[PDB]
Design a protein around this ligand. Structure first.
Ligand SMILES: Nc1nc2c(ncn2[C@@H]2O[C@H](COP(=O)(O)OP(=O)(O)O)[C@@H](O)[C@H]2O)c(=O)[nH]1
Ligand SMILES: [Mg+2]
Lengths: 127, 179
């Protein structure tokens, strides 16, 4: 009922070797992965390494490129559009949790903190 | 190279990350357990053909509910996990996890995976479970839920002892190579 399956374990971070770097023609899902990674790294900077999940997820956006590129679906392009708002809401929620802040103050802090960190990230993109 | 993307999903504390580390490294972690498994990919030979296998962990807490599905696109098989000494986590398979993955990846197959089976025969866990009424989840009742929710099958393992560990991922690979 069953083929011969042999897993070739290797020690260490080998995963980068497995990435398929070749871009789709229209609506690259991989490009979506890159933008989402950038947004997640921004939220990780704001939350200031108090939340390693965001960094891990940014890392996964790279790992996801083990699957060959294809055009993105509409649910995928909408999710990438909704991501910023959703990260801001997480930061907001976290700031009500950790600090005393009322929801609307937390949201205002989150939006401004995110916008500013996003600008710094963009202006620190290398040549 | 052809690629299998496997995503591991389930409640916090059921042993998602440790299952992944014990399987890939053959060691159970005590000193470094991140919330989400480090980036991992490996070569698997399936009937003489080389496949890339990518294993993806997730953060199961509700704080991440809008972020977690970013890792779902192109998934070939899900592992929906619950601890066999946590009825709470078993319940959430039915009410949260399977509804979630089938809303995003509606035709992607998934296995139902029971974790921490070495705690079935540990008195203190059963002791604590007798208080406020619960018993461990049996393969019988778990196999029923798998039939009910249309999982490929129920598989079981202990990351700590490595029992059933190899088989969970063999079955996942097989379920991924399907119609
Ligand atoms: N006894 C036992 N404990 C386990 C096993 N797997 C995980 N654990 C413990 O369960 C807790 C949570 O495990 P973790 O991998 O972080 O779960 P996650 O939140 O689903 O990623 C940790 O304290 C682990 O040491 C197992 O197979 N047996
Ligand atoms: Mg974890």
């Amino acid at each position: 009922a069953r083929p011969e399956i042999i897993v070739l374990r290797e020690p260490g971070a080998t995963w980068g070797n497995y990435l398929q770097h070749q871009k789709a023609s229209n609506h690259s899902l991989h490009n979506l992965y890159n933008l989402q990674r950038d947004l997640l790294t921004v939220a990780a900077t704001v939350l200031g390494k108090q939340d390693p999940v965001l960094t891990s997820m940014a890392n996964q956006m790279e790992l996801a490129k083990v699957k060959a590129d294809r055009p993105a679906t509409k649910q995928e392009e909408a999710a990438a559009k909704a991501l910023k708002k959703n990260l801001i809401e997480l930061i907001a929620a976290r700031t009500q949790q950790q600090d005393g802040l009322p929801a609307k103050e937390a949201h205002r802090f989150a939006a401004v903190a995110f916008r500013d960190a996003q600008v710094k990230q963009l202006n620190n993109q290398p040549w | 190279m052809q690629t299998i993307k496997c995503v591991v999903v389930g409640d916090g504390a059921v042993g998602k990350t440790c299952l992944l580390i014990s399987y890939t490294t053959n060691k159970f972690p005590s000193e470094y357990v991140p919330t989400v498994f480090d980036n991992y990919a490996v070569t698997v030979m399936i009937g003489g053909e080389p496949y890339t296998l990518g294993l993806f962990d997730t953060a199961g807490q509700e704080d991440y509910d809008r972020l977690r599905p970013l890792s779902y696109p192109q998934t070939d098989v899900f592992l929906v996990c619950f601890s066999v000494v946590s009825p709470s986590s078993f319940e959430n398979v039915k009410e949260k996890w399977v509804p979630e993955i089938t809303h995003h990846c509606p035709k992607t197959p998934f296995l139902l995976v029971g974790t921490q089976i070495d705690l079935r025969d540990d008195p203190s866990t059963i002791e604590k479970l007798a208080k406020n009424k619960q018993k461990p989840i049996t393969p019988e009742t778990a196999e029923k839920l798998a039939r009910d929710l249309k999982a490929v099958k129920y598989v079981e393992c202990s990351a700590l002892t490595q029992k059933g560990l190899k088989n969970v991922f063999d079955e996942a690979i097989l379920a991924a190579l399907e119609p």
